[PDB]
Design a protein around this ligand. Sequence first.
Ligand SMILES: [Zn+2]
Lengths: 138, 94, 124, 208, 83, 100
Amino acid sequence: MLTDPIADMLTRIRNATRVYKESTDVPASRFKEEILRILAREGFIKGYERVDVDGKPYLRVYLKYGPRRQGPDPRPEQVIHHIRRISKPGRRVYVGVKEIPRVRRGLGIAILSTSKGVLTDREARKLGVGGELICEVW
Amino acid sequence: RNLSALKRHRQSLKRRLRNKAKKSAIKTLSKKAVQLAQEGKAEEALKIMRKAESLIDKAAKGSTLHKNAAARRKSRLMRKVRQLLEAAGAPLIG
Amino acid sequence: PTINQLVRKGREKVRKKSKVPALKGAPFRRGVCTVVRTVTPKKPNSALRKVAKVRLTSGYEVTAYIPGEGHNLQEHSVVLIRGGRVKDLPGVRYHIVRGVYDAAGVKDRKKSRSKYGTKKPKEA
Amino acid sequence: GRYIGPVCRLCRREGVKLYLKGERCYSPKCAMERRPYPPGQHGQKRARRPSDYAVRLREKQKLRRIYGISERQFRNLFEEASKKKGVTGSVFLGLLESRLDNVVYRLGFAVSRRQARQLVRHGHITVNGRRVDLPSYRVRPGDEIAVAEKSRNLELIRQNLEAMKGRKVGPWLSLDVEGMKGKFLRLPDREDLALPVNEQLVIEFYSR
Amino acid sequence: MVKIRLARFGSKHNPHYRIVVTDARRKRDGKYIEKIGYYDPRKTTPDWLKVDVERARYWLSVGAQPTDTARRLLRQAGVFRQE
Amino acid sequence: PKKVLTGVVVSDKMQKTVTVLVERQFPHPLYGKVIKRSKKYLAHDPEEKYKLGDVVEIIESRPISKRKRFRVLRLVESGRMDLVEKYLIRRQNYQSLSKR
RNA sequence: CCCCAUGUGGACCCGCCCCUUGGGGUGUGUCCAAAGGGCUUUGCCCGCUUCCGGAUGGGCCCGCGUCCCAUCAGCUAGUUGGUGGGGUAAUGGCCCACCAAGGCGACGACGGGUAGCCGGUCUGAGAGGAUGGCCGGCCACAGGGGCACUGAGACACGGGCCCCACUCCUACGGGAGGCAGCAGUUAGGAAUCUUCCGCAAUGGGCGCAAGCCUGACGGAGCGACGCCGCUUGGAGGAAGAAGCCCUUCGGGGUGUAAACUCCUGAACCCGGGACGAAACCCCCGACGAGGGGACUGACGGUACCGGGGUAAUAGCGCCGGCCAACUCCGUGCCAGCAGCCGCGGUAAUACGGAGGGCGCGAGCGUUACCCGGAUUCACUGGGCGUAAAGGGCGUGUAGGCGGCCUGGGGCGUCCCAUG
RNA sequence: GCCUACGGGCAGGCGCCGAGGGUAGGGCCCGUGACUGGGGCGAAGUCGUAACAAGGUAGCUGUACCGGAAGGUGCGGCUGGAU
Ligand SMILES: [Zn+2]
């Protein structure tokens, strides 16, 4: 069974970039939408539009890559090198505001879900809250 | 092999006998007043309950009756009496 | 293992077995020598090593090594033990503290005197 | 046993000039002049490439031996220096240069570091007014490290100051030769130090 | 009967006290109730004795016989000066 | 603040007493995930009102019997065997897994 | 000690009003008080009685936390609950009687093993692991087991009663003992101190006070057992003594090291000499505030200041790799070394001595034990095709885990304040 | 019996509980031990050659019986079998 949504998502994303696709589909859902909402505004991706595949609702997340390298294997640096769920189901991990992590000397980002909504470590702290720390991405 | 802080034991005995005679005294009186109410001696029963209540409160004055101790005895006595005086009402004295 | 596993079950912490039954965690322990042999070495090296069977205060009657170019350990002599296995001499997990008790310090030692329990020789 | 044995031999062990005797380690002879090889029967022999450890080591010592201070204090200092907010290295030299015995030396009230000690243990040193015999003492900024009235007319000290009219004092220090006084201005900066050492190696060494 | 006393805190030859309030029955250097000042026998610092009369007054009020020596320090602090 | 627990009557064989199943939740002291644990309290019903399968609020009371220092507060949600059933099947299972 | 009276008040029964598990107000009935002593003796001090409150101290209770073994899986009969009664300061199976048939257990009952618990401490980047003596807080015993008395409080280490083991007196009937207090004795052991000084200070008890007691304590002493400071000297001094070591015999080295020159001056000597101590007391003032007077140190003639003053202990480990430090000789799989890999059978940087060298210094080694390295029990942070690891397969119980939209609740979860 | 203001108190007596003991039976843990299995070590003798190359009858294996020995054989399974 599909045991963790977000998780799948992240993996479709992760799994797509690696092969270098332009965009990748993925089951829609307000929440998942708010995460993609972040990515693009954070710049890890171009953007995403709502869609219907044979009648079902899907989110087209549009991939973003780096320039063509020189020399051998000109496989472009990927905008999203790292991306993993931190709090998994059956080992959920909530953090306190003090405890919010700094990612990659603050190069990456972290996304939680606070009672004031789904956020970025930076935003959270600016916001004075903490919550389910969904994922690392850099 | 001596120590004068033993005089205390020499004393405790004195109080053992002291307390003893008082405590038992009460028991007897209570146990006396009791069987009266069984028979319905409304007059005398109390005549005794009264001698009881006093004795109790008297020990309470000293180190013989813990304090509230007197109290319990005062409750467990009177109550055990009133009730019995239902088998034949009308308290004579009061 | 699934986190649940780690939950229901938990990690087994590694128990430690002591390489030395000097009963108490004592550093040494005196004992009376029983037999004084000369066990032969192990596989590669061969020679003739002086050894001693010792009855301790803890109860066990063990085998200890006697370092030094030569000792002076008799039958019912009292001795002392420090503990220190010997590779080419199996079953010999202990040692005899030289210079303490009825065991002498090696005579004619001018080097690692700290051990062997000799004393500062003269010249000034 | 706070060392005290053959000296301008260490000038030799390190291969860098160790100003351990003062006058003389200026005459053709801190030995490094004309006998740079290290001591021992094998001094003149070709030396193999020194393990990372070796350099980290030899360099600790170079520091240490200069100040001539029992590892135990030296390491203690370095520990105390790790606990202070700062560049773990510069601060080290900080206290290192703040020891009464050193100060005296820099103040010029002595031919050498060693000499300075005695000067202290024998008590020829005033400190903000009172005498002091504990060298290891830490001279706070703004202290009048001086000479005891009693000691002023000394064949040694005298002949020393006589020399001072002719040498600038460390930038973090002042002194009025005329009155044989001197003040400790402020903790000296790494940029101010001359030392032929590389703290980094020293630090790197204490993490093994 | 809660008293008001001193507490050894210095060391071998370096006595440094501690004015406090605690139940008679406790140890010298044992769990006190409300620390209200310290006094330095040898007087090395210009500040060899403090008090906070405000709290001192509380105690006495509620009933807290102070030690002979103890009191003396409270008097110096002006614990009881009624002018 | 005298403690208050919410749980369920599972036992009703006793006199004026009821066994209440009280579930608690919390992150594992080291592994982090939410562990769900529980305990049974012997509540106290004077007028024998509370019945099996009822959810109730427990409150710390004056000691009563050996191991019966709680009175029941108010009935929360009545009729819900669902939970009992579980407790029961678990108990029954106990009969298995042995050396008889 | 007892009795009798007074009763501010307080107790108990009953009734009502308020509260709300035995909280508070109230009415009648009944029951309950008590000691005197001292002076500066017509008043002040100490003490006394009943009651409300305070403060401090504590009993009982509950939630969460709290080691290993499942080669311990079922435990329980006062046992789980109820009524009544006893008992207590008090709730309670705590105890008794009767009644009911329960209570607990894989969210590990019961059995076994081990261990006083914590603040903290050790290590660790941390998470964690280890510990829990000195100091402080709490518990537990005071030869073994039982029990109660007296008391605000004990089931009472230097109080009591009994039995038991042990030691000693004994006219053999019967007794006397308990250092896990300080010091010490002996035993056991690798190993752990002086039958010291003082009651000056701090604290405690009793006292109106002077004051008494205080092996609590404050000191000294013994142990490099730890840590920290300190010394054995400083400067000058040869293209370089001697001896010892090495050599390609020319020389290298030990080495500015020494000698010797000058200078300083630990030890040691003489003198001075301490804070810690200012109270209670006494006096004046109202025994208040405030002010004045007196006594009183174990440490100790010690610290410390002044003067004078001798150049005046160095040792242990290591030098094949890890790992800083190399030559010669003796030796010859011997003697021996060794943490691990190993070294030694005539050329040993690995044995034994020596010269030399490195390391550390009143210390250095060794053994033992903790954490560490070890992400080698893996939460951080592991694995399972052949390296050790998928259950021979299925079935499904407990349990874990779970799809999209909207709303309520908000337990988890996050934020604020506060204790 | 002792005391008394005769209300009542002490002495004593009996009783329950009860530390501990006796008798019977059971369980469980420590010491010593005759008799006894195998084990691991180590240089190395003895008889044979099983395995490692198709090791010279491919090997390995559950089982079963047999045998100085290693092992042989049956039956089934496997390749982790050379050509
Ligand atoms: Zn020099």
